[PDB]
Symmetry: C3
């Protein structure tokens, strides 16, 4: 599929921003769930509003027309719904509509044809019935991996573009369940904690790259899939992160060779939860949340903007295989033109005696509890 390279780079792009944001934290995300939600969103959007997005999903528009893109997506999504039988792989892109919404059909058609979208009809005014209906469609799409994707749901909520992906794949070679031997994880420069560490001896597709100063191990799944890992060298984690490319990835994919090794790889369950707004904004994708937000391509009546862009992604690893899930969530409610200035982020301020123009106090609010 012709679009894959861009996705890869967008995954690297997007990963980078998340680590650039917090070194001291766990990271896991679905580049696909995200980009899809947004390409699938890009349809209701037009002009320079829309352009930002797809140059920010790492696409070169002075090269590929819009048509050739959305085809690629369509193809890929399809591919994933029909794997080998031993490999469980689903994806669903449901679109929940407020009851009483005057739509455009050009949009309506397009997301149904190209993005297998499912439209449902919910009362956002009954917000805690709306939360249920939506957390229903996720907590089954993800087959019960992700449930609480919507914790706060606006009543003024127009619609909600929702996306999910479910993965469950068993290993090429399961691990010894009795050989799962609790061990030390050297967490930071400084600290150490106990994990259920799985150990196995055998012949492994693994190599060191001078370029990435890392060990690159591949673990083929039962079916048509592969997890790739990277043991950075001592103090090379950031150098590694720095240096990842699609083509480097491709090179590794094809390396068929194996060799003897003793491997220790831990049993774990992790989550990444995100409001991406900030993050994405950094990728150039700012207009679509704002009051210059072009959502004409969805409906006439009312003028909207994209409220919160929320991703959540869990992962879980054990001897037999992997459980992995991604899940987008784009809320939109009525845009209001009248310009908006909210001090919902840390800020400064004085207080001045009018007559003599002298500061009584000054300060910076950085948090109101407890400070």
């Amino acid at each position: 599929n012709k679009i894959t390279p861009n996705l890869a780079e967008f995954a690297f792009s997007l990963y980078r921003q998340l680590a650039h944001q917090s070194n001291s934290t766990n990271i896991f995300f679905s580049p696909v769930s995200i980009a899809t939600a947004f390409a699938m969103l890009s349809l209701g959007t037009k002009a320079d509003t829309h352009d930002e997005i797809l140059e920010g999903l790492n696409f070169n528009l002075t090269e590929i027309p819009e048509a050739q893109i959305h085809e690629g997506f369509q193809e890929l999504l399809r591919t994933l719904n029909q794997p080998d039988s031993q490999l469980q792989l689903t994806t669903g892109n449901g679109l929940f509509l407020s009851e009483g919404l005057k739509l455009v059909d050009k949009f309506l058609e397009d997301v149904k044809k190209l993005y297998h979208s499912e439209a449902f009809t919910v009362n956002f005014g009954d917000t805690e019935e709306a939360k249920k209906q939506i957390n229903d469609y996720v907590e089954k799409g993800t087959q019960g991996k992700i449930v609480d994707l919507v914790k706060e749901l606006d009543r003024d909520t127009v619609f909600a573009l929702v996306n999910y992906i479910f993965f469950k794949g068993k290993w090429e070679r399961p691990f010894e369940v009795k050989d799962t031997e609790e061990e030390d994880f050297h967490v930071d420069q400084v600290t150490t904690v106990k994990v259920p560490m799985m150990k196995r001896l055998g012949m492994f597709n693994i190599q060191h790259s001078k370029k990435l100063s890392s060990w690159v191990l591949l673990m083929k799944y039962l079916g048509n899939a592969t997890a790739i890992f990277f043991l950075p060298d001592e103090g090379k984690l950031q150098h590694l992160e720095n240096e990842l490319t699609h083509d480097i990835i491709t090179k590794f994919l094809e390396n068929e060779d194996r060799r003897s090794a003793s491997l220790h790889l831990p049993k774990l369950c992790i989550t990444g939860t995100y409001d991406l707004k900030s993050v994405l904004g950094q990728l150039g994708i700012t207009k679509v949340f704002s009051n210059g937000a072009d959502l004409s391509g969805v409906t006439e009546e009312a003028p909207l903007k994209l409220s919160k862009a929320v991703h959540k992604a869990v992962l879980c690893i054990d001897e037999k295989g992997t459980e992995a899930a991604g899940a987008m969530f784009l809320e939109a409610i009525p845009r209001s033109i009248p310009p908006e200035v909210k001090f919902n982020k840390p800020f400064v301020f004085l207080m001045i005696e009018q007559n003599t123009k002298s500061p009584l106090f000054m300060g910076k609010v950085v948090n109101p509890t407890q400070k």
Copy 2:
């Protein structure tokens, strides 16, 4: 009042040091409470001891004589005691004396005339009656906003120069109490918490400055007062802080223009508490705590130094207006000439076998609980 510019800059000076000290914390202080305490203190002090201070309250002594300064203070303090009636504004500079103190009258006169000072007579030897008496005079001066300004009170405590300011002012336009809508505060690059966010739509004195890369909103009070706020731009908080000046402030004060806006500004109650010694020291104000400390200008019998320089400042904001308070505290007890070296800050050390001069151990104490 001719001295205001210097105060402003001292407020910026002093603010800067507090943020330079801890980004990751809340900030609120009264530039006035502080400077006053210290100008009012500068009176008992002489020569190069004294000079440090006022060059450190941001005054140019090769320009303004001492006379012209203390007049300015006197005037200002006065101004503040008699505002518009709708605007509550008090200040008091009480000076608590140990029973049995031989004073100088030149000093005694000066702080009574110029700084409306009130002198009281307390037994520092009965320390927890001394704590009460002083926390009495504050927790009413601040009308019950600040109470625990003295948590640890030396028995060898000679006197205590105390300062307070109380502010209570209602808005130009109160906010909708039913429109106070709990919302998300994006606290750090990383984290998010729920505040009571006040929202109102109307015509606001607000502008963006290229220079400060911030939004500058003014909210006039009932009476003769104005609070100024600053929404830094994305990642401009430090650039903003960097760039603030008196004249820039003045420029904004006069901008009368208003315009349409939707504003979200949160309901909060914050405190800043400080031992300033360190901080101030950085402003050049070091001699006055030390054994070169010139407190002759107060009394003959005994030779003193300034023990702890303590500021505390609370603030509180809601729909109708603002409650804000500042409070200094300068403790002095008997200086002791005999040079002093205290390892009360983190330090290094070895242990050596005398005969062979070999290190048995080495270390750095950085804290004795738990380490």
Copy 3:
């Protein structure tokens, strides 16, 4: 003793790495306990494996032969076992052997002659009887200061090179027990906590060095010993740490002069606990944990490597004197040649759809609880 300079520098070397690793933490270690363990270990080791070590204990091998080194150690250790009577000083270097171990006698002899080593015979297969036996020999060697040196003990544990040092020395001048006056410790740039601060006025060997921008105080012990302290100047702690040398230390040792001072020095009990592997590795000492690990010089049957290099060092200070203790621990179990790659440190990884080579997920595991 000719080797002392190197130890000093190794102590500085090693200290530096520990602070370079975590500013925000307490530091205390025995340069001697460590180096001894390792010189005493170096005996079972040969060639380039062995060389790394002693160039990393700060020795110049293109200058001093191996003979001249191990003599020095022998001499020093001896010296320490027979001090002045008023000064309690012991050291023991016990070596615990698995029952059924075919040894080399060249090694056996050498560590008995040169390093007063004591060999014992333990069943590592009964691991929690092994833990006892070893924590026995430490928690008496250290006369009950250090007890839990072995919290996790491998069953496949071959042997354990163990080292200890016990110190108890009373002051030149005890402090006033009734003059121990709780006070403020300014811990960080930012925070403050209460310590039992000992205070005394008298004549103290103390000086300021332009070079180290610190106060350098010596406190002679009852007997043949001296503790040295360093009050860095404001913000000079790192400059101080930077600049320490053996010769500078020597210069200070000899300064006999005293003078009047008021000193405040706190009552405390601190510990430093370490797995040194990382740290030491940085000093060039990497081969000996690895699969190129040359432990032929110990036994024939089986091929081993050094599993965990563990130091723990407590300290305690009060009016009368000091309790101080160091304790090494080098575990070795069967090396396994077959190359080893363990993701027991934070790492990256993708998951790829084989057919289209597109990233489903990506991530970085940095900790599996809670993330």
